[PDB]
């Protein structure tokens, strides 16, 4: 088989979207509150997540059909999926040699111990690192990495979503281009689609654990005051 | 005349309170989002104001009788007076030679042009610098500088204040210790009390202009997102 012109255009739009929103130089990281190694890493990691939310929003706006959804559906999709998209895009800086997210220099190299200094426990950090290792070992083509982030974002099974039918038709079409892409373009990829779909289920589990950890810090005003207004909006519980 | 033991104890408590909350080394400034010289200075100056609000709160908690007020009256007093106390305590770093706030190194030296890079116009910055120059020329003893900040904070004529009678009795007693202090301890200070009281009226005018400027940036979400949660609470319009 061969993939069509429509499926090819979807791929081009999604990889362009990612290149426009993921900065491989990590040059804006110098603008965050500096890393410090009680909760010494929270200011820096809150600025990092806030910055990453902005990029996820930018990325989502460029996904074919996302802008056509109501502002309420776009908001419901981003509030539920943002942390899962952050965990996926972070895989690009994750290093198997160091078991850490390496964003250029040693100042922006984050290990398990650095993340516990932002208030997280091993209940989240152990499955998070296991997920990063597992994802990295899949050796995803950039086309597959960007489709997985778009599939994750366009999931209709999220709280507060109204146009379920439309969102499912968008996700289904993306899943079709991914399966076709793996089959035609990825040599030895016969079990890959099933593996990527399983990573989406691992992400639901990570999102749950993350929501518990976020509730723990957001309920302590001395810690929630270190977050940014965008993190408070997106990880918050308000309903539109 | 001579000042009493009660008035002496008030003075000691207020100067101790200031030394505990004003860091002459400016060593925490390295932890803010770095200064950058659209609205390039906003991240740094929002972190500076957020930090300064925390210090004003700490200072207020140590003013004799402030802790005895209801949480609602403490909140009403801080929301109205915070920016005026920030403008007063900032006088300690203000330099007449540079017409700028000098907080150690050149990175933490703020001139009129740096502040316009946080979204402020000359409508506020011209009277603000004129006030800083005027205050600095008064050559206030540290005892007088700390009494003026406490008098400013304990002003009963603020929106949302309930126990007006109690707050006025606290401010009156502070005004009495200031007049007595100037008369007995400040040589050639016969016109000083009247000058310091006028600075309080200049501060009401600056607070007005500041509220307009803050409304202008807080109404633009791309700019309000650069503020911290504590700045949004304290400069916000919510009523308790």
């Amino acid at each position: 088989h061969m993939l069509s012109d429509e499926q090819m255009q979807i791929i081009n739009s999604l990889v362009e979207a990612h290149h426009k929103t993921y900065d491989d130089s990590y040059s804006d990281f110098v603008r965050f509150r500096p890393p410090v190694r009680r909760l010494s890493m929270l200011p820096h990691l809150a600025d990092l997540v806030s910055y990453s939310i902005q990029k996820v929003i930018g990325f989502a706006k460029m996904i074919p059909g996302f802008r056509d959804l109501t502002a309420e559906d776009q908001i419901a999709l981003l509030k539920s999926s943002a942390i899962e998209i952050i965990m996926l895009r972070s895989n690009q800086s994750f290093s198997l040699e160091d078991m850490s997210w390496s964003c250029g220099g040693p100042d922006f190299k984050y290990c398990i111990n650095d993340v516990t200094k932002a208030g997280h426990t091993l209940e989240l950090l152990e499955p998070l690192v296991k997920f990063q290792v597992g994802l990295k070992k899949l050796k995803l083509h950039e086309e597959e990495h960007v489709l997985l982030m778009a599939i994750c974002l366009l999931s209709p099974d999220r709280p507060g979503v109204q146009d379920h039918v439309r969102i499912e038709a968008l996700q289904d079409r993306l899943c079709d281009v991914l399966q076709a892409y793996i089959r035609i373009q990825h040599p030895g990829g016969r079990l890959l689609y099933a593996k990527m779909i399983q990573k989406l289920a691992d992400l639901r589990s990570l999102n749950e654990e993350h929501s518990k950890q976020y509730r723990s810090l957001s309920f302590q005003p001395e810690h929630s005051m270190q977050l940014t207004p965008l993190v408070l909006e997106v990880f918050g519980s308000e309903v539109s | 005349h001579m000042l009493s033991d009660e008035q002496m104890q008030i003075i000691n408590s207020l100067v101790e309170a200031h030394h505990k909350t004003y860091d002459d080394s400016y060593s925490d400034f390295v932890r803010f989002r770095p200064p950058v010289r659209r609205l390039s200075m906003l991240p740094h100056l929002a972190d500076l104001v957020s930090y300064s609000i925390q210090k004003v709160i700490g200072f207020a908690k140590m003013i004799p009788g402030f802790r005895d007020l209801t949480a609602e009256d403490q909140i009403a007093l801080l929301k109205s007076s915070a920016i005026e106390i920030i403008m007063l305590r900032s006088n300690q770093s203000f330099s007449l030679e540079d017409m700028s706030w000098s907080c150690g190194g050149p990175d933490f030296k703020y001139c009129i042009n740096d502040v316009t890079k946080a979204g402020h116009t000359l409508e506020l910055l011209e009277p603000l610098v004129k006030f800083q120059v005027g205050l600095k020329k008064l050559k206030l003893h540290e005892e007088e500088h700390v009494l003026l900040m406490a008098i400013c904070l304990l002003s009963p004529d603020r929106p949302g204040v309930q126990d007006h009678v109690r707050i006025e009795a606290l401010q009156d007693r502070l005004c009495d210790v200031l007049q007595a202090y100037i008369r007995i301890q400040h040589p050639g200070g016969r016109l000083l009390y009247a000058k310091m009281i006028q600075k309080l009226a200049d501060l009401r005018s600056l607070n007005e202009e500041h509220s307009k400027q803050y409304r202008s940036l807080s109404f633009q979400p791309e700019h309000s997102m650069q503020l911290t949660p504590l700045v949004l609470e304290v400069f916000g319009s919510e009523v308790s």
């Binding site: 929003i57 908001i75 | 979400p221």
Partner: peptide, 11 residues
């Protein structure tokens, strides 16, 4: 509600 989110989602 979602003041920042609405603005970042515009155009």
């Amino acid at each position: 509600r979602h003041k920042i989110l609405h603005r970042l989602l515009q155009e």
